[PDB]
């Protein structure tokens, strides 16, 4: 119902001069649209490009279900036992939320706590999930402990069984009634606070904050 927001961002007025360009916002337009892509192939995850694990595909999975390999192993990273209904063959369960300790466990203790021996670091590991996000996070975990061959199946259980289930949807969009830090706290100068809070437009256009602008005297002439 388009709830009014409680942020104190405000466009500049039409009476006073523009001043204090120590901080100055502007609109920020990137090159391409990115929302259509995989979550971890977007701009804010660009730094982990070499870290994103290799992608396995539907034909490889359908081959491997029938003709399994002694060393490879599929791992289901699904968490909601209620959400997970059916079983991908030759797969071991290891939910994403506890990989941090699962991969720290010892060889004996891992078998003790999970019932299947901890794979060797030189072995091929495949990770699948609902949409691939839990599999990606689990693969990052696996890579941290120096596991050489880690893969994820991006189109996972949903593609296998035709399911339309979804993985975690925990986005940290601040609730409208919460007022962010800059408008509340007293930590910088008055004019700096005003210029930080100012935005040139509808406050959903992904503006950019730049510091220390200088006048283009040659253009002005």
């Amino acid at each position: 119902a388009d709830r009014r927001t409680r942020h104190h961002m405000m466009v500049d007025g039409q009476i006073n001069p523009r001043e204090w360009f120590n901080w100055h916002p502007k609109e920020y337009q990137p090159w391409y649209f990115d929302r259509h892509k995989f979550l971890y192939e977007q701009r804010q995850y660009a730094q982990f490009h070499h870290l994103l694990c290799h992608q396995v595909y539907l034909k490889d999975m359908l081959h491997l279900m029938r003709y399994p390999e002694p060393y490879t192993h599929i791992i289901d990273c699904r968490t909601s036992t209620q959400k997970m209904h059916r079983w991908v063959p030759h797969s071991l369960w290891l939910p994403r939320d506890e990989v941090e300790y699962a991969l720290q466990l010892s060889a004996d203790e891992f078998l003790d706590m999970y019932g299947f021996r901890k794979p060797d670091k030189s072995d091929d590991v495949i990770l699948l999930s609902h949409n691939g996000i839990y599999s990606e996070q689990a693969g990052w975990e696996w890579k941290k402990q120096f596991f050489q061959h880690v893969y994820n199946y991006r189109g996972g259980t949903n593609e296998l069984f035709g399911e339309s289930y979804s993985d975690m949807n925990v986005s940290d969009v601040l609730s409208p009634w919460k007022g962010p830090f800059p408008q509340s706290g007293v930590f910088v100068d008055k004019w700096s606070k005003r210029k930080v809070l100012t935005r040139t437009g509808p406050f959903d256009r992904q503006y950019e904050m730049q510091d220390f602008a200088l006048p283009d005297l040659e253009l002005e002439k």
């Binding site: 359908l62 279900m65 063959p89």
Partner: peptide, 16 residues
């Protein structure tokens, strides 16, 4: 509980 129609495992398991 869900009953989908785009299952890929089913046709391979049926013949097996």
């Amino acid at each position: 509980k869900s009953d989908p129609a785009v299952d890929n495992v089913a046709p391979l398991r049926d013949e097996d």
